Amino acid sequence: PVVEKIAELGKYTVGEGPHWDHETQTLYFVDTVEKTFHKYVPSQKKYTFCKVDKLVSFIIPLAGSPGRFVVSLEREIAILTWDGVSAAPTSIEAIVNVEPHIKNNRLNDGKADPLGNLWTGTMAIDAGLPIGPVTGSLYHLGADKKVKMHESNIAIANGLAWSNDLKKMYYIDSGKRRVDEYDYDASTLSISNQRPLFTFEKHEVPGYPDGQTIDEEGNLWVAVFQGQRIIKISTQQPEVLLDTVKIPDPQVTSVAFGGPNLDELYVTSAGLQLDDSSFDKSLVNGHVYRVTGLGVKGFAGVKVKL
Ligand SMILES: [Hg+2]
Ligand SMILES: [Hg+2]
Ligand SMILES: [Mg+2]
């Protein structure tokens, strides 16, 4: 595979939450510390950003409403109306605060399931690795604007994906250094039967699982924070490492398939230099990467239905 730095995009403190909108051929993503949203149109080499004053962790187009996006603002799920180019949104409409009385929590990774339901989890703002406060939970937001809790005791609420047949959900609590698998009931939106799918310890994989996505063959692609890589793992059989793609940035954060043929893998990373790093500062930059020649296709980003 070929890994290219996207020079036009610069460096991000914690680049995160990549989302590919296939209809407009546009990549959206966030910087979860700098309180900014980002838009990249590769075919036209257009880049824009948008500033808010709360911590953000995802940005997903709202189904049926061009120019509107479902985003996180600390603990609030909100709709931002944004023209895609001005440095500030036009308007902000709060939907729900998922944890109004837990003042030191924030939302982290979030994604729509294939039915358009937003799933997202929380974490302590001062969550730590390998050890720190464990205060997070996993939620989904129904079309009735009520949240349901699905999992608790989450340290660092991170990557989500669903199997192509809607029978499984994959989930990452970075603190656990593993990818979990759940049975997923699409009709009731309930998850059960949590079991480890892939355990980093067992495969001498360094670092922490962060974001993830799934390809058309049902394989998971997992971003490895402080591992300088993405890994390809099987969902058909537990504990099978299929492939490793090295990324120059050590703090790989997340992944999304994109491009006209959905066969380009966009990779975000973090330039934020941490205390206990296994990598010298000069290596930690926070670029965005494009990976091609993986030989698989993924799926377009799902919009949130409300
Ligand atoms: Hg924006
Ligand atoms: Hg925005
Ligand atoms: Mg993440």
Author numbering: 3 to 308
Text from the published report:
Here, selenomethionine derivatization and mercury soaking have been investigated for SFX experiments using the high-energy XFEL at the SPring-8 Angstrom Compact Free-Electron Laser (SACLA), Hyogo, Japan. Three successful cases are reported of single-wavelength anomalous diffraction (SAD) phasing using X-rays of less than 1 Å wavelength with reasonable numbers of diffraction patterns (13 000, 60 000 and 11 000). Such high-energy X-rays, which are essential for Se-SAD, allowed us to collect data at high resolution (1.4–1.6 Å) and perform SAD phasing with 11 000–60 000 indexed patterns.
In our earlier study using CrystFEL Version 0.5.3a, we found that SAD phasing of Hg-derivative microcrystals of LRE at a wavelength of 0.984 Å (12.6 keV) was not successful. The localization of the Hg site required 11 000 patterns. In the anomalous difference Fourier map, two Hg atoms with peak heights of 30.4σ and 7.1σ were identified near the cysteine residue with occupancies of 0.65 and 0.14, respectively. In SAD phasing, the phase improvement technique is essential, where high-resolution reflections play an important role, while low-resolution reflections contain a larger anomalous signal that enables substructure determination.
